[PDB]
Structure formats: structure tokens, C-alpha cells
Symmetry: D2
Subunit: 224 residues, 4 copies
Amino acid sequence: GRLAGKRVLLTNADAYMGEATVQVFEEEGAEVIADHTDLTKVGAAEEVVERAGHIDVLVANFAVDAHFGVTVLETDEELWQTAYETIVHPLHRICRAVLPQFYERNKGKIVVYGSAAAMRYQEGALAYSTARFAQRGYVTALGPEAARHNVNVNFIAQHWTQNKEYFWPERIATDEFKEDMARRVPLGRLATAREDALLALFLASDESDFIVGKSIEFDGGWAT
Amino acid sequence: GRLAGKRVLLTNADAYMGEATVQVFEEEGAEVIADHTDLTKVGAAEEVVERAGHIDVLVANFAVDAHFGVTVLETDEELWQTAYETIVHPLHRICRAVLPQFYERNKGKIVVYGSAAAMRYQEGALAYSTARFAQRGYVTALGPEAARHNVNVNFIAQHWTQNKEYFWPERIATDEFKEDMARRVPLGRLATAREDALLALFLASDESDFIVGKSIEFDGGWAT
Amino acid sequence: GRLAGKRVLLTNADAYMGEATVQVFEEEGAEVIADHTDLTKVGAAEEVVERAGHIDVLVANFAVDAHFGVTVLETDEELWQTAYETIVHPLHRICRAVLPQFYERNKGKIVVYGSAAAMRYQEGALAYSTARFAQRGYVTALGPEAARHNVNVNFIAQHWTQNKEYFWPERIATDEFKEDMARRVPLGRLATAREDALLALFLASDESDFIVGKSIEFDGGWAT
Amino acid sequence: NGRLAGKRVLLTNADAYMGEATVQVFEEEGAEVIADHTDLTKVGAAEEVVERAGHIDVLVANFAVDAHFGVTVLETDEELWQTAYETIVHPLHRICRAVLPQFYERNKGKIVVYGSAAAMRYQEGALAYSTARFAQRGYVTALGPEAARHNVNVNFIAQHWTQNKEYFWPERIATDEFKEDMARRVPLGRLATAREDALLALFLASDESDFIVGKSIEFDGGWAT
Ligand SMILES: N#CCC(O)CC#N
Ligand SMILES: N#CCC(O)CC#N
Ligand SMILES: N#CCC(O)CC#N
Ligand SMILES: N#CCC(O)CC#N
Ligand SMILES: N#CCC(O)CC#N
């Protein structure tokens, strides 16, 4: 097993990419703590880790409505703030909580399921895009700092990937979605959740200790 | 006069890069509304703009203490939130407020004084770096949306530039800061505030209409 | 004049972006040496610079047929070699020929007219794309080495800009071209040659001394 | 069983650069590796390597040339400049162009290029070399999305600070000067072993990476971050 003997902490395990992570990571021998705690609440992250015990890998799995099609002028205070409360501030909270034990053992792995909208313009997703950009920046600024304690932190800039929040069955069925994907995605298809978790498995494994603070675009060529 | 006839709204005119902006923009024939409002408060942004009246150019000039040297574990909730409350959330409030008149005229200019820390890793500046990454994301996401209305939105990714909040006289006088800069900046010197303002000037002028949602690194070669 | 008292060497001055560089640069006070030498020949570049005498600015102006639509399998040896012989190998020859006198004075400016196909995937332009990437790497690698001597080397990553080689009047006059351009270019128009030269002007001027080895995307937001 | 079970891999210049770790890692994982030693700077050579090789599922484009560390722009003469391109740029297209027809026939293929982080960010004192690596990166960026329409993956490993004889031979890395540069410039604070580089290439060559198209993955301990 490529994660044999590892204990993995997965945030919001029922949302976004959690289901495929559990399935892939367990079949590679990991013990996956599938947490369901709302990490927008101050203090919650410190407790999840406390109750978790020994963590080898943190899979920071956060998602929020992109509000596709909402314009800049329609991006009101609540919508803007909710993007940050939901995927930005919790990211630092939960990473801060795991790092002490990582630093104790001079070893650790963090994988962030982010978005290729943090790499390049995605139309109609303003507040959301800026929040993923901030996630991306967290990995860019933390990666090399944590690398000094032999901790890897990396960012999956995913897009066109099966999940409820962004590519739900109703959306991907329309003629309009299929024409737009064909124009914009060179590979011409969506990724499966499993393919996403296979990249994360690499980034969570000890096969990837030399990858630090990087954004790997998981997008079928979209941002190329 | 390269800004002849233009009116310019400058945020936090006394902080960060405001002084050099007034100097250079006024020399090129612009009226500069030098604002000192605390755009942290909901509603302030809209009222600066109503009072300002006609605006051809918004210079979004925001700054927060980088808290140099503060590590990830020492980056507490207050410090983290302050970075976003000070330079991220207000940026969208003020850009949302001027865009309506830009869209009526099908013309507009937005210049964001940002950070090269939004482009690449800057040691000991975690919270701040993620916040600058949010600003960069805002320019990347908004730029192409606004450009359909002939509105230019761009990002100056500056570093190693004279200002009080990051390169104040006491910090840059040490013999050993000079050695560090000399290793990290290929040009081997700090930029003057004025040089930064001459880049903002180009981006604010109608000489730069084809520049859309870009991050121009203004850093002596640091991130190259 | 913003180039008052400057002498500018412009390669292939009757091709690509030369005409507009002469007009804009002469308007700003510069003497423009409009060279037509075939710099694909060894020894030519050194002779040109010897004839030119005192140079403050080099505008590396090279272009080659992109063979739009030719695929990887039909990109034969001769087509591949020609792209490098035309725009890659000559670039090093003329910059190497100019740098000695810049190093004596510890001052110089090099502006490269490049392509946004050096930044992002451009359909059906394989050999040409890789040659522009090479140009971009030359700016990226030389930039910081030349900046030690207070010399600026920068790259204009242009696209959707009027010129005979890539956007000649016939090609851009059809309704099909305009509809594709409207989809791919957020600003929704081509740039004028003059607008391109106004960015070169900024990068050739002493207002841009802090810009080192950078690629500035001049593409209506295409690559954003 | 193996992550490349049943796959036939064509590896160029198998004794140079990252070739040896590639053989070892890929074969541990069930691959049959065709370890080519042909000089692909000769026109027509790439086509013959592919024909003589039979069925190919993965091409590992493994090319290196002397970086000429420390050689200045003014010292970069015609022959040095030309040699960097003749050695790692021109053959890259020759060998990919030669293998793609059978990939396109089967609507399936993998290409992994061992490149350089010098193709991503400024690396001191390696001018001609850096621009040749930049051209490799551009090849992947431009070919990547084109080949992806035929279900072929082309990706670029932008490696630095990684075991090899061309760029980290023993005399170079023994000096105090080099050890202090690395500690300052490499967040992880060490060099990679060739095995670790090959494990990334393993991922990119496997069918676990079908969704990675024309990308540059930085394998540099954080140097370019
Ligand atoms: N899948 C996924 C991430 C989402 O950001 C894509 C978009 N827009
Ligand atoms: N000058 C300036 C902006 C600051 O972000 C640089 C740093 N660190
Ligand atoms: N104009 C121009 C540069 C050209 O390379 C754009 C394309 N394709
Ligand atoms: N190729 C290569 C590297 C070599 O030229 C330097 C040594 N030892
Ligand atoms: N500079 C440098 C090293 C890189 O070019 C390849 C490796 N390893």
C-alpha cells in the first residue's frame, strides 16, 4: 500500500472531493479520519486535531458555491464574505493545528484541493476565484516555510472534475455545457473524482517529498 | 500631459504609495482626489465615489503590516483576519463602486498597488502574502470581465520599493539588510516611490488600453 | 521627449513592429537606426553595432511565419529549423554585440518584441511557439545577469496585434476572424501597432529601470 | 501488480541524465523499457529508433547538455549556443514527431520530458542552456493541448537540485560555496535522489495521470516557489 501505516485527516469528508479520497486512500492502506466538523467556527480545528491524535497527512478539502454567472456588481457583502469564511480562513486554522506534530517529527504532508480558477481567469466566478487564489497563496507562502521541517504542502488546481458543487449531473448534461467543455478542455472530457484523488495520493505519499509549495493544474489542459 | 483632463481617485492617499502617485499624476495633468476614508467600513466606498463625482481612474492603494518574521504557528486569528479586512475586502468594495460609471461610458482604468509576494514566496510574511494573492486573483478575475466594457484592471506586483510599511528608513539602513537585498535583487537597489508611480502612470494612461488583468512584477528582478 | 537624446537600434525595421516603433520613438525624441541587415549570418550583428556607434536602446524585432494550422506531424525539419534560425539565434547575436558598450557605461535597454504564444498554448503554431519560448527564456536568463550592470532586458508577449506576419488586413477583415477574436480576446478588438510601440516606449525609457527580465502580456486579456 | 504492467517504454539516451533511475523505477513497476542509446542529433535517426522499437506506449524524452555553469553572455559563442539547441531541442521534436503517429492511431499515448526548472525561473550562469530548456518547455506547452485531442499526455518535469552527473557531479557539490547556495535557495535543504525524480515520471507515464495535459511540474525542493 502506497499509504501503508499512514493516518490521514480529511476535512469536510462528505463534500467536494472527500468521497474519492477515502476510497483511494484506504485502498492504498491509509487510515482515513473522515471529519465532518464545520471549520468556520473558531477553535474547531484545534479540537478536531486534538481528537484525531497522530496525523501523517492532512487533506484540506474545502468548497463553496462559485455563484456561476453572478457579476462583479451583483457580488454583495454577504456573498463575498462567505467565500472567504468557507474556504480561506478555515484552511489556515486547520493547517496551523496539524503543523506542531508535523514539526515535532520533522515530517508531514498537506494536500489542498483547490481550483484552476486560482491559476487563470474563470468567467462568472469572481468572489470564488479570489478565494481560491488566496488558498493558492497559502500553499505558495507556507510550502517553502514548512519544507524546512520536511513538511510538503501542495495545491491541486483542479477544474472540469466530477463533484456536486461545480459539475453536478444537471449542469453537465446540457448541450451548452458540452459545447463549452469541448471548446475549452483539450482532453475533451471531465476528470473522474478518482483521477483527482490519484494525484492527491501521489502528493500525499512519500513518492513526492521533493514537491514543495506547488500548484499542479488538474484541468485537462484548460489553463495550458 | 499624459493624464490631461483626467480625474483620479486615490485610496489611502497618505499610506503606502499614495504620495508618489499624487506627485507624478499631478505633474502629468490630472486632478487627483486624494482620499483618506477608511474603506474597511461597509458603505464608505459607495459614498467616496458619489462625492468624488466623475472618475476616469481608480488607483487602489492599500497596505497592511506584513509582520515580517512571524511564522505560521504565530499567525493568530486576529493577525490573519486583519490582513484580509485591511487590503482584500475593501478592494472589491471600491472597485464595485466605480465600475457603474465606467460601464456607462465604456471606459475605465483601475490600477492596484500590489506585491511580488503575490507572485512568489516571500519569507516570513504568511498572512500578508495570502492577502496579496487575493488581490492578484481579484485583478485576474475582474480584469477580463471589465475589459468587455473597455475597462482596464491591472496589478502592480511590487517589491524592494521605498515606502513606510515595508521598507522604512530604519529597516533599510542596516549593513546586513543591504547584503541581503544584494543577493536577492539582481538590479541591486531599491526602487524609488516615484519609479513605481511611473508604472502606475503608464497603466492609468490611455497608452495601455490593451493591458487586461495582468500582474506586472515591479521588483528589480527578484521574482524573475 | 521621453527618449530625448537617445539613439535606438531597431532590427528588421521594415518588418513586424518596426514601422510603428520608428514613428512612436521618433515622436519622443529618439534617433532610430532602422537596420535591415540579415542577422541570420554570423558576423553581421557585430558589424551593425560597430556602424551604429553609441546605442542607448536595442529593440530586438524579429518575426517568422507561424504556419498557422500546420500540425506536429507536418512540422518538418526545414520548417522547424527556419523558426529558430529566424528569431532565436539572431536574438543572442545582436544582444551579445550590444552589451559590451552597455557594460562600459553601466546602462542599457533591450526590448524584445515577442509573443503571447511564449506564455500560453496557441493553437496550430508549434515550431513558432517553441521559438518564442526560447526568446522568452533568453530574456528571463539574460535579464538578471544584465541587471547587475544596470541594463534592462524585457519581453513583450504580444498577440492580436496588427502586423503583416500574423494579423494582415485580409485575414482580419473576414467575419469568421472577428467572431473567433471576440470569443478569445476579452477586450474584443485587435491592438494597433502604435499601442504596441507605446509599451516598448515605456520599456525603452528611463521610467522603467526597475523592470528586469519580465514578460509583459500584450494580448487584450487573451492569456489572462 | 505493477503500475506500468504491460507497457513498453522508449527511453532516449538511456545512459545519460535521468536514464538509469528511469530504467530501475519503471522496471520495478512492470514496464519493458527499450533503453535507446542512439544519437538523435542526426536527422532521420529518431524515425529509425521508433521503427526498430515496435510497439511503444510511453516515450521518456531524456536529453541533457553541458550547462556551462559560469559562462557569461559575452562568452556564449556561436558553437556553444548552437550546441545547446542541437543537443536537447531539435531532437525532442524529432523523437516526439516520430512516435505520435502510432499514439494517434490508438488514441492513446504518454510522453514525459525530463526538463529543468531553469525553464521556469532564472538560474544563474547558464544562459544558452536555460533558453534551450525554455524551448523544451514551450514544446510541451504547445504540443500538450494538441496531442490531448488524441488522448495523448505530454508533460514536462522542471527539475532542479536533483542527482545527476551533468549538473550535480561530485566536484561541483562538494564545495562550501555550493552547500551555502543550496541551503539559501532550496527550501527543502537537500538534493533529490534520482529515484524520486523517476517516481514523478512514473506517475506522469502511468494511466493515473490521464488528466495532466501539457503541464510543467516543478521538481526542485521549492527553489522556484
Ligand atoms: N472542479 C473544480 C474546481 C472548480 O473551481 C472548477 C471551476 N470553476
Ligand atoms: N514594496 C512592497 C510591497 C511588499 O509586499 C514587498 C514585500 N515583502
Ligand atoms: N501579433 C503577434 C505575435 C504572434 O505570435 C501572435 C500569435 N499567434
Ligand atoms: N555535461 C556535463 C557536465 C560537465 O560538462 C561538467 C562536469 N563534470
Ligand atoms: N541548473 C540546473 C539543473 C537543471 O537544469 C536540470 C537538473 N537537475
